[PDB]
Symmetry: D2
Subunit: 266 residues, 4 copies
Amino acid sequence: EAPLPQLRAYTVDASWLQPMAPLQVADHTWQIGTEDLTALLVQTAEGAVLLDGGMPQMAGHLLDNMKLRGVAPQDLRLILLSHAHADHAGPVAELKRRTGAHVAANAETAVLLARGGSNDLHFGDGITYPPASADRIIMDGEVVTVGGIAFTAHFMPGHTPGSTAWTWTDTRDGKPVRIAYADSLSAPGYQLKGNPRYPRLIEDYKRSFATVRALPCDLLLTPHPGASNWNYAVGSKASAEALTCNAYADAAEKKFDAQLARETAG
Amino acid sequence: EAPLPQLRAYTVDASWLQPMAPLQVADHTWQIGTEDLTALLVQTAEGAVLLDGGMPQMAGHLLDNMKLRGVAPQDLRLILLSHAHADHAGPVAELKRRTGAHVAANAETAVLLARGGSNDLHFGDGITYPPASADRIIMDGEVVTVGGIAFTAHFMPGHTPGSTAWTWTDTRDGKPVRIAYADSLSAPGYQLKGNPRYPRLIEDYKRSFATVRALPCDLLLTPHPGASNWNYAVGSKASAEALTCNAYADAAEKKFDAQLARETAG
Amino acid sequence: EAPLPQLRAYTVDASWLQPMAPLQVADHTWQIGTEDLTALLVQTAEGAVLLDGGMPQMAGHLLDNMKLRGVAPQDLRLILLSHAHADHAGPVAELKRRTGAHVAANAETAVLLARGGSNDLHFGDGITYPPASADRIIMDGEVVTVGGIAFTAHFMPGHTPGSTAWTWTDTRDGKPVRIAYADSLSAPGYQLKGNPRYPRLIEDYKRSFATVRALPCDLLLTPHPGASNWNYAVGSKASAEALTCNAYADAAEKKFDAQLARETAG
Amino acid sequence: EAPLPQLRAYTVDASWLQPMAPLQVADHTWQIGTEDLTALLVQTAEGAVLLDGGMPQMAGHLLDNMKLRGVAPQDLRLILLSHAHADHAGPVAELKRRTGAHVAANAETAVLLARGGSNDLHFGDGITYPPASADRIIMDGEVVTVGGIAFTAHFMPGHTPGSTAWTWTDTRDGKPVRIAYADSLSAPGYQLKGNPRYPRLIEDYKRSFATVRALPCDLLLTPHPGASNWNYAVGSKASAEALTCNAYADAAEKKFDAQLARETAG
Ligand SMILES: C=C1CO[C@H]([C@@](NC(=O)[C@H](C(=O)O)c2ccc(O)cc2)(OC)C(=O)O)N=C1C(=O)O
Ligand SMILES: C=C1CO[C@H]([C@@](NC(=O)[C@H](C(=O)O)c2ccc(O)cc2)(OC)C(=O)O)N=C1C(=O)O
Ligand SMILES: C=C1CO[C@H]([C@@](NC(=O)[C@H](C(=O)O)c2ccc(O)cc2)(OC)C(=O)O)N=C1C(=O)O
Ligand SMILES: C=C1CO[C@H]([C@@](NC(=O)[C@H](C(=O)O)c2ccc(O)cc2)(OC)C(=O)O)N=C1C(=O)O
Ligand SMILES: [Zn+2]
Ligand SMILES: [Zn+2]
Ligand SMILES: [Zn+2]
Ligand SMILES: [Zn+2]
Ligand SMILES: [Zn+2]
Ligand SMILES: [Zn+2]
Ligand SMILES: [Zn+2]
Ligand SMILES: [Zn+2]
């Protein structure tokens, strides 16, 4: 008779694993991940910051791209996260071992990271990755500064309880560019209504749409570039179609409301 | 050009995942795992002890077999481990959540369990499983008692730094039966000589062969039943060919010495 | 010249350490702490729940009072917390070791408990106690059930980020009694305005006053009994002067507003 | 009647808390702790290593002395430990927060550090300090390298299960100086015989005396300088009376044997 099933790997679309060379976003900020997963390197005079790392197998590629930017592994000071799912926080444990960087995250993200994404409220154990510890717990609105560049956290729970937007002001052409790295606002396959593991899920998403609308933003980026209409594969045109924060929140809320009604409709 | 490779699942021989009904080993001790992975249930008047759980996907099967033995999930008091690899400690996190059982383990096993088997000294991240915490740290020779049944730990590092044998005295036919659950003594694909991550690996294995030879033992069991010549599929004959501790240690040391010479021979 | 100062113990008023016999609050609910620190035992047909434990040195007294109630150490299933300061979560690590109970707490409380109250946002390292791990992370509004008794969490951040109210329905004289165990709403010596470690502190307190006002409540209790006008020393009259949730929130908000104005006034 | 006792601070002799200016031990190695607690700074071209930090309240003094040596807080790369008691690992959590340094330690030291020294096998909760996590787990004989300087770990369990000696080769007057930082070999107030929490304590101490005798050593230092006959207060004569490793082990074993006989004599 049937044995128990084999473990199943977390597999993703090939484009999520397609390496790309560093793509400059602003004077200090570079996309160094893959064509379809964001990993932002912010280079300061006193070390570098990494916002997300993508999938677990991207660790070596990130370090290669850091080197192309002039950033040795030991020059990475800080890792920040949008949320601690395997496709965004995947390589954090290995990056910490190889660079000595600290991780700063809120308490929800810290607990999810420390169990390697296992016992996910919606996905169970299907997206487990190597666990890592947060070295600094941050609060809503708290400012983290590296090399004089200030990163502000904005909690936007929903996609995960610890989902966070990060904002900072870079420059281009002598003018300030307020960058907003807003987290995912999707709820893929989630039970939204009356979820015993997340009883206030709908209230949190609804508040998070409003938080995203209010972010300081001249240039929006998202963990999945397509969610904000970026196309990392087309170089200097990558940002051309990028959404505003208002438009990103509006699109996400329309999808959310439609899913809520479909969930009511079985 | 080539994308990065997909993550690869830890896949195992089908027999390792083949469920079996509880097989009685002695008056209080039952094999409740699969045909080719040991999971021992020891039933006391004040709750049950589980020694190993096998693969992550075995959690539900273990609880089903516990129920057949009269053990409700909440009746499981304690989980002990041979070593914290995915094929023996796989379901520990889920079992803790569903039963409330505590885990007792030495410090090496505790740290490996808490990172879900990631950053393995020999296997890297290939056998990651859901992380779990140890609630009680135990020392070499320490006695853990449940319902009056005393379990003694014997450290036998090598296969993992935290590899542990557990001994207890059960009964059969009114006579004592000294059970020894000795850990794996294999080194599959390991660099044995001059390993920078495990510099005293050879000294530890050699000492562990001697520890196994000295265990109090009328009946030897091992995490992989074939390592001690058990055959769980043949019921009342399962133990017929089981090795002594002396013979298990001798076979393991001969394989180890041969591998050492082959490693010297490239 | 002066050596560095000696470490300073966290010392408290004597009444906080004055043992008392169990005081019945409702049919299943007992105050089993000290005259001036709440520790609530809820006894079910399938084990007991403890809400808070007081100071670290109260562990033995709590177990003595449990025994007087018919609760053996192993009968304690679950520990819940108001917040993870030393005077309320102090003995949690020792209670877990001696009872096997699981701890359920939100992520903020879990991270503070796991560092033993060290690096407190307001108190630094002055109130460090033995660290403990949370076995179950709970979300706002999540229901935890033991022996059929359902406990609902209501997040009320401010006094700590993880501050939680717990509600359950007990009985007395054949009628339901909705019990609300609401956390502290004090801010003792806290910098309220522009606090870089807690930038939205004021917004959180203000929301928490509203949450407390809305709790289902026939009988309010608080970690410090005086905060809700209980007097545990007078037995059957202990609850006579107890505040409503509305009155507790109103008193706390008036104190908060006054402190805010004094902080503005240097 | 009597309330429960107040918590008691871990108080130490004043000389353990008496700051001193940096005292040069060899070309790259400086004592930067207090007159009676060792904290060794090793300065490399690629950052600094700290071996022990003393008491929790010494964090600021250590950073001041680092600054006098030209080491900014961010220049500290690595913290190593002799053992994780409050008088040697006390300030590790704060140093990690303020410097970004990683901690490397064996599994036993890592688990004790992570519970802040609470639930000590011999001292209970009396010497609890702020918990910290180890970022790198090291094995017996493993080499950790910073700026080209190689530090080798030698496990010497007894005083704690995780007690470790660290060796490295510095220079003086153009000649190599093999430095051995050997851990404590005391057993203050310990039950040595038949200790249920440490059943092989005597075997471990006896092996550790032999390990210390075998260390590569031109210059021995110890966490308590008096244990190896150092006197940090007399500057250029501080090392004059320092013991050899053989003499340190011999003195420690004689004290141990005498205590064993006194323990046998009640
Ligand atoms: C829109 C998506 C969907 O894809 C990923 C996601 N999901 C998946 O990759 C995918 C899925 O939802 O179909 C999945 C595959 C396998 C699983 O075991 C779980 C999820 O990553 C975990 C998720 O967060 O839902 N992430 C997002 C996102 O917004 O970040
Ligand atoms: C003899 C073996 C080999 O099989 C397992 C083992 N190995 C494997 O299952 C297998 C292998 O060694 O070929 C393996 C598959 C995939 C991997 O990524 C790593 C290891 O489990 C992790 C191991 O510990 O070596 N365990 C033992 C054992 O003695 O416990
Ligand atoms: C109103 C108070 C004040 O007393 C305690 C408290 N504070 C103290 O006990 C006390 C103080 O605030 O004066 C204190 C003594 C010593 C310290 O190091 C820190 C705080 O416990 C940590 C606190 O949370 O502020 N708790 C409350 C409370 O509402 O729970
Ligand atoms: C010889 C000693 C004695 O002093 C310290 C020690 N002990 C004490 O400081 C002291 C004592 O043993 O008398 C102590 C004071 C208070 C306590 O709660 C516990 C211990 O530090 C924890 C210890 O490790 O035993 N350390 C050593 C040592 O060798 O490192
Ligand atoms: Zn996601
Ligand atoms: Zn995603
Ligand atoms: Zn294995
Ligand atoms: Zn195996
Ligand atoms: Zn408090
Ligand atoms: Zn309090
Ligand atoms: Zn010590
Ligand atoms: Zn000491």
